[PDB]
C-alpha cells in the first residue's frame, strides 16, 4: 500500500514532445542537441516498457490538441503516464514552435477529476526548458485531491535558465537517462531523481567565450505531489 500499483497490463504512455525548430517570427533559436535527448529518452523509456510516442516541432495548437486527445484515451489498463517536454520556456510556460503554452493548461487535462482512468496513478511530467533568465554562478567546494499524484521533474530551479549542449544533449536529460538506465531496477524514483540532481550539480559547468555565460551551474528541481513510492519494476 506504500507503493503505486505498477503491474497493470501496460506501464503506460510516454509522450515525448521535441521542439527543435521555431517559427522565424518568434525569434526563438534552434535547439541543437535536442534530438540526442529525444533519442535517449525514447530508448530509456522503451527499456522501462513504456509505449513511447515521439512528436517533433509541434505548434502551440498541436501541443494542446495532442494533450487533450491523450487525456481522453482509456488508460484503465495502464499503470502510469509520462510526458516529456523539450523546448524553450519561461516561468510556467513551454513553447510551441509558434508561441507559448501554459503548463497548467496541459497538466489540467490529467487532473484526477478530468482523466478518470488515471485517477490514483502517477502522472509524471519531465521538462527540459528554461524557467527564467537567472544564472547560477555556483560556489567552490472518500475523495483524493485533483492535484494529487503529479510529479514534475524540472531540469532547473525556478527562475533559472536550463543548459543544453549542442553535441551531447541537455545536462538534465543526459543525466536522467543515465540514472534511469543504472538504477531503475534498484531505486525508488525520488532517489533516482536525487541522483540526477547530484549528477547535474556536480559534473556539469558551462563553458563560454562570453563571461556572462561562462562557468555557470545548474540544479534540477523535483516537485512532487505523489502519494506513494514509484518503482519501475
Amino acid at each position: 500500500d506504500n507503493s503505486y500499483k505498477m503491474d497493470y497490463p501496460e506501464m503506460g504512455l510516454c509522450i515525448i514532445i521535441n521542439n527543435k525548430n521555431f517559427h522565424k517570427s518568434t525569434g526563438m533559436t534552434s535547439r541543437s542537441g535536442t534530438d540526442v535527448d529525444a533519442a535517449n529518452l525514447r530508448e530509456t523509456f522503451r527499456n522501462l516498457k513504456y509505449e513511447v510516442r515521439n512528436k517533433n516541432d509541434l505548434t502551440r495548437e498541436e501541443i494542446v490538441e495532442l494533450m487533450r486527445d491523450v487525456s481522453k484515451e482509456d488508460h484503465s489498463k495502464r499503470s502510469s503516464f509520462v510526458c516529456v517536454l523539450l523546448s524553450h520556456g519561461e516561468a510556467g510556460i513551454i513553447f510551441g514552435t509558434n508561441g507559448p503554452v501554459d503548463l497548467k493548461k496541459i497538466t489540467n487535462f490529467f487532473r484526477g477529476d478530468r482523466c478518470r482512468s488515471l485517477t490514483g496513478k502517477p502522472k509524471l511530467f519531465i521538462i527540459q526548458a528554461c524557467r527564467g533568465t537567472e544564472l547560477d554562478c555556483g560556489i567552490e567546494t472518500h475523495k483524493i485531491p485533483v492535484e494529487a499524484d503529479f510529479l514534475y521533474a524540472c531540469s532547473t530551479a525556478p527562475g533559472y535558465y536550463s543548459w543544453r549542449n549542442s553535441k551531447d544533449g541537455s545536462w538534465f536529460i543526459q543525466s536522467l537517462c543515465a540514472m534511469l538506465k543504472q538504477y531503475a531496477d534498484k531505486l525508488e524514483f525520488m532517489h533516482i531523481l536525487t541522483r540526477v540532481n547530484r549528477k547535474v550539480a556536480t559534473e556539469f559547468e558551462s563553458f563560454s567565450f562570453d563571461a556572462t555565460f561562462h562557468a555557470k551551474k545548474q540544479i534540477p528541481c523535483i516537485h512532487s505531489m505523489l502519494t506513494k513510492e514509484l518503482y519501475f519494476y
Partner: peptide, 4 residues
C-alpha cells in the same frame, strides 16, 4: 553549451 547553450541556454533554452
Amino acid at each position: 553549451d547553450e541556454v533554452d
